[PDB]
Structures are given as structure tokens and as C-alpha cells.
Amino acid sequence: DADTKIWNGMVGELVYGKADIAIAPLTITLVREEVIDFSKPFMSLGISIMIKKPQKSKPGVFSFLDPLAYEIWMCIVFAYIGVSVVLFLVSRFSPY
Amino acid sequence: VGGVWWFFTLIIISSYTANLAAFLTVERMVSPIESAEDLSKQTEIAYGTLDSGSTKEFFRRSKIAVFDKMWTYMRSAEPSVFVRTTAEGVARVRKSKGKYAYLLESTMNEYIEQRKPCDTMKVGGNLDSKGYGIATPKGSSLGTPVNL
Amino acid sequence: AVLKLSEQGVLDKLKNKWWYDKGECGAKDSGSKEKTSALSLSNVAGVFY
Amino acid sequence: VGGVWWFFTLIIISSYTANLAAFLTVERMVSPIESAEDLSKQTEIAYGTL
Amino acid sequence: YAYLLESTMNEYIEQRKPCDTMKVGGNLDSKGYGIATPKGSSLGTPVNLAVLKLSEQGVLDKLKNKWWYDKGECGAKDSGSKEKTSALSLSNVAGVFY
Numbered sequence: 477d478a479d480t481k482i483w484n485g486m487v488g489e490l491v492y493g494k495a496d497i498a499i500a501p502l503t504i505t506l507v508r509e510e511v512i513d514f515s516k517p518f519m520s521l522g523i524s525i526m527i528k529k530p531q532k533s534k535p536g537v538f539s540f541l542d543p544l545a546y547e548i549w550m551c552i553v554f555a556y557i558g559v560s561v562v563l564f565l566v567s568r569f570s571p572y
Numbered sequence: 573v574g575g576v577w578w579f580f581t582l583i584i585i586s587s588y589t590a591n592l593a594a595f596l597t598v599e600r601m602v603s604p605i606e607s608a609e610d611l612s613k614q615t616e617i618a619y620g621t622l623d624s625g626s627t628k629e630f631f632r633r634s635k636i637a638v639f640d641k642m643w644t645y646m647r648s649a650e651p652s653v654f655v656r657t658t659a660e661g662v663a664r665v666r667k668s669k670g671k672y673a674y675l676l677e678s679t680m681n682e683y684i685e686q687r688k689p690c691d692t693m694k695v696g697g698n699l700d701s702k703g704y705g706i707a708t709p710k711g712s713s714l715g716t717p718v719n720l
Numbered sequence: 721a722v723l724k725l726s727e728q729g730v731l732d733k734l735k736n737k738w739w740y741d742k743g744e745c746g747a748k749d750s751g752s753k754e755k756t757s758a759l760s761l762s763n764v765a766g767v768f769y
Numbered sequence: 770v771g772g773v774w775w776f777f778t779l780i781i782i783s784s785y786t787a788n789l790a791a792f793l794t795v796e797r798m799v800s801p802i803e804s805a806e807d808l809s810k811q812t813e814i815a816y817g818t819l
Numbered sequence: 820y821a822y823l824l825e826s827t828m829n830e831y832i833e834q835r836k837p838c839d840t841m842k843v844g845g846n847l848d849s850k851g852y853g854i855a856t857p858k859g860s861s862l863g864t865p866v867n868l869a870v871l872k873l874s875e876q877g878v879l880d881k882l883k884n885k886w887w888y889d890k891g892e893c894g895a896k897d898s899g900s901k902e903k904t905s906a907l908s909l910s911n912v913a914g915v916f917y
């Protein structure tokens with residue numbers, strides 16, 4: 477506790493003699509050494525950081541079409557046709 | 573007409589290959605900056621610990637300046653980044669939409685990442701080397717036969 | 721007393737604090753990151769002209 | 770002649786297409802002045818102090 | 820002839836010249852050095868309290884940086900994160916001619 481040092485939780489269970497042993501996920505600290513005895517440590521760990529999983533997008537079936545935007549594919553076909561007809565326009569033009 | 577069309581098709585699909593190589597280079601999503609250190613620096617994503625946690629006491633006692641600066645923020649984090657129970661902080665992050673980090677232990681972080689729907693992620697390494705140990709009341713007879 | 725803190729560089733630590741530990745707006749951070757892809761028609765449209 | 774010219778154009782356009790999508794997105798800058806000196810000269814943009 | 824030793828040894832000698840070692844696999848177990856006294860000495864508690872400060876103050880890590888990582892000497896710890904050369908050689912090519 478603040479200013480009265482009353483160990484809440486699981487610590488006062490063995491400090492104030494309420495329980496007999498604490499087999500639990502309990503980290504050995506320094507200030508806990510002063511109030512209760514311990515065993516040798518059995519599982520090492522540390523401060524981890526957990527954040528969300530930020531949602532990778534998968535490729536599609538047409539993933540080869542991706543390095544050119546949707547419009548230009550439609551735009552190039554338009555340009556493809558009109559190029560060809562003008563060639564065919566000047567192709568047959570009454571050779572005299 | 574044709575050399576124009578030659579000049580057209582020369583530019584276009586050669587430029588296609590340049591972008592096509594660019595997709596086969598890399599696909600790594602950057603997953604923003606770890607070993608966090610921006611939690612000290614940015615104001616965007618909050619971060620908290622468990623109530624009555626040793627880590628919550630650790631940064632109170634931590635003398636490293638960034639950890640001080642985190643603790644400087646964590647004492648001034650309004651509202652409470654601190655949570656009382658475990659999954660309390662977990663689904664808080666899950667609904668935070670990447671706006672609240674949370675600190676826990678390595679054995680926890682690996683285990684909840686094995687849970688469905690895997691929506692967590694551990695970033696960086698740990699910060700320290702801690703260890704669980706079995707505790708007794710101080711001065712009990714049980715100490716040596718347990719610890720053997 | 722000024723000459724100690726300059727010699728101890730505490731001013732710099734403060735100069736990091738009030739300018740650089742609060743680097744907020746953008747391109748200080750985002751200027752050293754990666755880029756996108758997928759060429760757009762606005763890059764291209766003069767060729768069709 | 771063309772054997773020179775093919776060997777010519779092979780080394781040219783390969784170098785031309787070393788990178789091009791890098792060169793289609795730059796969006797660089799405008800920045801008319803730095804050391805102003807046109808604030809003395811132009812009448813367009815004013816300028817003041819505290 | 821293989822040889823068995825400890826993880827802190829295996830990482831340290833791999834940092835030595837001429838780097839001719841290699842650690843393979845993981846470890847086999849989880850051991851730990853600890854300071855020992857004669858059994859029943861008075862020194863036990865004041866030592867074992869004093870250890871917990873430096874671990875909590877991380878001074879051991881600063882020392883662990885000192886005696887392993889501030890003396891990263893042999894090569895690929897440094898040169899493994901650098902750039903590369905160019906100019907393709909015939910040994911890369913010679914099977915094509917075959």
C-alpha cells in the first residue's frame with residue numbers, strides 16, 4: 477500500500493500468513509525478496525510488447541496486371557484499335 | 573504512322589518492365605516503428621500496463637531516460653492506459669485500431685499470438701531478463717525441500 | 721554556471737527535448753521511409769497527345 | 770554498317786531503360802527564392818518583421 | 820571432431836578471429852551461472868540481495884555489451900550489413916558454354 481506498505485494481492489497472502497504457498501506466474505523482483513522467500517527461478521521471460529496484426533493484403537489472380545493501373549489497360553485498347561484503322565484507311569486509297 | 577506506333581510501344585511496355593521488376597523486389601509491410609521508442613516520442617498510440625504490476629512499478633523505478641519519459645507519459649496518460657486484468661488490455665488494443673499499445677510478458681505475448689484470430693503481434697525483443705520462481709512465506713521450513 | 725551546462729551539454733539534451741523529442745509534423749519521420757508503386761495515367765497522358 | 774549501328778543502338782536504349790518509372794515520379798519543388806534579394810527587387814511579395 | 824560448450828562461449832569465440840567456428844542448432848537446456856559461497860556462510864543474503872539491484876539496474880547488460888559486443892572484432896558482425904561488388908565473372912557463366 478501507499479504509505480502503509482500493506483501488500484495486497486498474492487503477496488500479503490504469504491506476508492500475512494493467509495496462504496501456505498504461491499505456485500503461480502509470479503515474477504521475482506527485488507522488493508518481493510524483503511517480504512517473502514523464493515525458490516530458484518524456473519522460467520525466464522521479459523517485458524514484451526504486444527500490438528495488433530496490421531492486415532496484409534494478398535495478391536490476386538491477375539497480379540501480373542497490377543503494375544499498370546486499371547484505366548490505361550482500357551485506354552491502350554482504345555488507342556490500339558484507332559491506330560490500326562487509320563493504317564487501313566491510308567492502305568486502300570485508289571492508287572492513282 | 574508506324575514509327576509513331578513503334579515509338580509508342582517502345583516507351584510503354586519497356587516502362588512496364590520497370591514497374592514489373594518493382595513488384596518482385598519486396599512485399600514487407602513495415603508494421604510501424606518497433607523497439608518502440610516512438611511511444612516516448614509520438615503522441616499517437618498510447619500504451620499501458622497491468623494495475624498492481626511489477627512493470628508498472630518498474631518504470632516508476634526505472635532510471636533509463638526513455639523509460640522515465642515513458643513513465644513521465646504513463647503517469648500523465650489521461651485517461652488510464654493502465655488496466656486491471658489481462659484480457660482487459662488485450663481487447664482494448666483489439667478495438668484500439670492501432671491507437672493503444674500494451675505491455676506484457678514474453679510468455680504471454682507468444683501464447684496469445686497462438687490464439688485465434690492471431691490478431692496480435694509481438695514487436696522487437698524483450699527489454700529485460702526476468703524469471704518466475706516459487707515463493708513461500710519468509711522463514712518457512714518448506715524452502716529447501718521445494719527448491720531442491 | 722552557464723559554462724558548466726554548456727560543457728556538460730545539458731542544453732543540447734534540452735535542445736533535443738524542446739525541438740527534436742517533439743518532432744511531430746511528418747516529413748522528419750516520413751521522409752526516410754519507403755514508397756508505393758503502380759504507375760498512373762497522369763504520368764503517361766502526354767505520350768498519347 | 771548496321772553491325773556498328775546495331776551494336777550502337779543496343780548499348781543506347783538499354784541504358785535508356787535502366788530506370789524509367791523512377792524518372793516518371795519526381796514532383797520535386799518550386800521554391801522561387803532563397804536569399805531573397807527580389808524582396809529588394811520585385812514589388813510582388815511583401816515582407817515584415819516583429 | 821565436434822565439440823560441446825556453452826552458448827556464451829560459442830557466441831564469443833565466433834566473434835574471435837578468424838571466425839572459423841560455427842554454432843549449429845539451438846541449445847539443449849536452460850542453465851545459469853550463479854555466485855556460490857561456502858554453505859552456511861553469513862555472506863549469502865547480502866550478496867544475493869546485491870545481485871538483484873544490478874540486474875534491475877541492468878549494469879550486467881552494460882557489462883555484457885562490454886565483454887562481448889563492444890569487442891565485436893571478427894568481421895561479419897560488421898561486414899555482414901554492408902554493400903556489395905559487381906562485374907560478373909566467367910565462373911558464374913561457364914556451365915552455359917558447356
Ligand SMILES: NS(=O)(=O)c1cc2c(cc1Cl)N[C@H]([C@H]1C[C@H]3C=C[C@@H]1C3)NS2(=O)=O
Pocket residue numbers: 516517518519520521703704849850851852
Ligand atoms: N527456458 S525457461 O525460461 O523456460 C527456463 C528457465 C530456467 C530454468 C529452466 C528453464 Cl526451462 N532453470 C534455471 C535454473 C536451473 C539452474 C540453472 C539455472 C537455474 C538454476 N532457472 S531459469 O534460468 O529461470
Ligand SMILES: N[C@@H](CCC(=O)O)C(=O)O
Pocket residue numbers: 501502503622624625626627628629677
Ligand atoms: N509476474 C508479474 C506480472 C506483472 C508485471 O510484469 O508487472 C508480477 O507478478 O508482478
